[PDB]
Amino acid sequence: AVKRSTRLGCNDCREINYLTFKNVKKNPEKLALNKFCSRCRKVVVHKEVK
């Protein structure tokens, strides 16, 4: 297999909410989206977590 997935975590409360897929070999940039966070109850910026 290839372990291409990755995990997004909120920055205010630092939980590890979301899971997605990203191909490092092309876009080395760290993803920074903004999605719903269950603890914070609103759309917060999520950034990647190892």
In the complex, which residues of this chain contact RNA (CB under 7 A)? 1-2, 4, 14-18, 20-23, 26-27, 31, 33-36, 38-39, 41-43
The tokens for 7 are: 């995990």
Residue ranges that bind Zn ion, judged by CB under 5 A = 10, 12-13, 37, 39-40, 44
22 vs 47, beta carbon nearer RNA: 22
Query: For residues 36 and 38, what is the distance between their CA atoms, to the nearest angstrom?
Result: 6
Could you say which of another protein, RNA, Zn ion, none residue 40 binds, taking C-beta under 5 to 8 angstroms by partner kind? Zn ion
